[PDB]
Ligand SMILES: NCCC[C@H](N)C(=O)O
Ligand SMILES: NCCC[C@H](N)C(=O)O
Ligand SMILES: NCCC[C@H](N)C(=O)O
Ligand SMILES: [Mn+2]
Ligand SMILES: [Mn+2]
């Protein structure tokens with residue numbers, strides 16, 4: 001039971017500052033101590049310095065191609081994450097990656113699927129993060145991870161993204177908590193027939209059923225390895241006051257946590273990402289002690305922490 | 311696919327000011343643009359000036375009969391709504407009426423049922439709005455609409471309400487979200503065996519099931535036309551901070567919206583009212599950008615807006 | 621239909637001040653008037669003066685045995701509650717006990733089970749309140765009631781607790797709403813195979829199902845008498861801003877109240893405690909008008925108050 005806590009302080013797909021501090025902030029909440037307690041031989045893994053990267057981020061303002069922003073910077077860092085996470089996996093360690101915006105999933109998913117090819121991917125998020133290079137209206141790369149992993153709009157994908165392995169197939173990615181999907185993305189999910197569970201399904205069926213469905217969706221046979229990429233903005237703002245992309249009708253804190261428990265309960269979780277943690281963006285005290293307190297909770301629950309005896 | 315957005319700035323059943331501004335406020339949120347986007351040929355229909363009416367409202371303080379207040383003023387305006395909504399319907403247009411307190415439903419329901427006789431009525435509200443003229447303790451007419459449409463307490467109903475057609479039958483009206491029913495009203499619903507779904511049923515069965523039930527209740531045959539009269543105070547205050555009649559245990563914003571989706575999904579919605587929108591009553595910024603933001607959302611969802619591809 | 625409203629202003633298991641004012645505060649909300657209205661011949665029963673007890677509480681700082689605090693004071697007062705509640709029961713009256721911290725359940729449960737031996741016990745709480753004398757880390761007795769009633773850790777239980785009857789068996793106590801269980805307690809529930817329903821079960825199954833289960837758990841035959849000991853901290857803080865022991869993921873106000881309705885609906889409720897009501901701890905106005913407004917609501921609903929005709 002070895003685990004590697006991958007620290008990815010990247011704020012590319014994200015505008016300015018805030019989301020790079022997540023890794024450190026989480027670790028301060030005792031994230032590693034919690035993991036050790038749950039019985040995990042934990043080892044940290046710093047893929048790069050958030051302070052330096054954040055630096056070049058601000059200065060370097062000419063990293064663009066179309067409306068797409070920071071292709072070079074984002075391609076450079078996500079490749080390092082891929083490599084790191086890939087080794088961690090090969091070494092037989094569990095990759096727990098702490099972001100950082102959701103653009104890091106480009107290196108995490110690639111990393112995990114490279115070693116675990118038949119692994120399913122449950123994307124817990126309010127957004128589909130599947131805009132293509134030419135489709136993206138905002139150009140923020142944290143909303144285009146999936147389009148790149150799935151190889152959509154190949155023609156328009158940068159040279160700096162040639163390092164991306166084509167290991168993710170549409171029937172291996174399921175969404176949970178969607179409620180802010182762009183028109184372009186709605187057609188994409190439909191056309192590729194991607195198992196997408198929006199807030200409608202949670203309201204209609206309840207979380208338990210949705211998780212069961214999402215799990216079945218990426219697991220033809222009830223034995224496949226499973227990876228969850230958890231965006232904390234999935235959780236309704238009321239619960240995630242310290243983030244940067246929420247809307248009307250998110251998951252309750254209870255649902256957000258129960259979901260984890262059902263996953264831990266499954267017993268086939270192979271990797272986990274926790275992203276979009278912005279302590280700064282929220283000038284209150286119950287705000288900063290949330291996206292990081294929430295992050296640790298998600299981590300603890302995902303990793304087995306239960307309410308009763310286990 | 312033609313629609314007529316009926317503007318009814320009436321604040322009769324309502325004490326003083328606030329609820330007459332709803333129509334304009336909604337339109338400012340781009341309500342008509344949203345409707346056009348959803349593919350509706352929309353045409354506005356001003357039934358009267360809220361500024362003038364509001365005026366005579368304040369001055370004219372002697373409009374009473376028993377504890378009942380503003381019978382004359384309320385009978386005068388609701389008849390204009392009836393007429394308007396009736397034509398809109400006959401012209402084959404969809405009546406989307408924006409209030410204004412719930413006393414306008416006296417003219418909306420009458421209008422719609424005059425043209426669509428076998429139409430069912432789903433009253434989404436925290437209150438039953440069925441107090442009789444002699445039964446009403448507060449005399450506020452926004453809490454007596456249904457008693458008049460159903461012809462209860464005929465003897466004590468004013469001459470100014472002679473214009474009201476008797477088109478609504480007890481087995482054609484279903485409630486959803488009830489939690490502030492007056493003793494008198496509880497006996498009335500029971501005696502007339504009206505399908506009433508309070509917050510108890512939502513807690514016990516979940517919203518999806520309740521909507522299904524409410525829909526079945528007013529649709530002997532699964533083909534009848536359906537009309538929803540949506541009171542925004544049904545939504546728990548936490549979600550409707552800008553209204554004027556909520557209590558302990560309302561619908562969540564998610565439920566409030568999912569309900570709409572199930573209705574739009576049904577495909578038999580023939581008319582829709584959105585009432586009790588008081589921007590003023592709530593001195594905050596997330597308050598005024600709610601009962602109007604909520605109203606538009608309800609409208610968009612009721613009219614087909616979905617989270618995924620459609 | 622006779623009822624005795626037992627006033628227990630005890631703040632032993634509780635640190636300093638606040639929770640002793642609950643009884644008076646509730647009565648001010650018209651608790652007795654509400655009970656009378658629901659058709660209950662109500663009679664108050666003051667077991668002791670909260671002002672005097674609170675007094676000796678502060679001064680007397682040497683009441684200890686191990687980490688356990690106020691054993692003498694807590695043993696003295698809870699015995700008076702037991703006696704009172706026992707008579708009330710024998711007189712055929714319904715004991716509605718208002719605390720006061722949850723340490724009073726030591727005298728309530730004993731009192732009720734003495735007269736109604738086969739009575740089941742539904743403990744609605746965020747905590748298990750089952751730490752043993754030697755197990756308790758904090759020494760606060762409000763977290764050790766159940767260990768004493770069940771006779772756990774006999775060896776280390778004080779002489780001042782010799783008055784406690786051994787009437788409660790493990791298969792006669794069910795939990796609902798658990799989410800803050802100490803490691804020691806988790807093993808205890810498991811080992812004694814106590815029916816425990818945490819927030820996981822509520823999220824997974826919904827409240828209705830949980831209550832049904834809890835009721836079945838303590839009722840081998842669907843006829844046994846039932847007692848509920850309601851800790852208001854079970855209700856998520858958002859709803860219980862005026863308490864002193866909540867965490868992440870409590871019951872919604874709706875659930876908290878629906879639960880009562882299902883219980884009242886059952887028809888076999890024989891006793892009821894409402895505890896952990898701290899008006900003071902919460903310097904707001906919607907806070908103090910909650911743990912007391914909530915308490916009365918719980919009482920009204922538990923005692924039959926419904927949303928529709930009954
Ligand atoms: N990761 C959030 C995505 C937000 C939006 N769809 C975008 O493309 O920027
Ligand atoms: N429309 C709100 C109704 C409130 C109350 N039942 C009344 O008759 O005034
Ligand atoms: N009644 C609240 C219990 C809190 C904690 N388990 C304790 O033993 O103090
Ligand atoms: Mn994302
Ligand atoms: Mn997102």
Ligand SMILES: [Mn+2]
Pocket residue numbers: 412435436437439452541
């Ligand atoms: Mn109404």
Ligand SMILES: [Mn+2]
Pocket residue numbers: 412435436437541543544555586
């Ligand atoms: Mn209403």
Ligand SMILES: [Mn+2]
Pocket residue numbers: 722745746747749762851
């Ligand atoms: Mn307790």
Ligand SMILES: [Mn+2]
Pocket residue numbers: 722745746747851853854865896
């Ligand atoms: Mn407790």
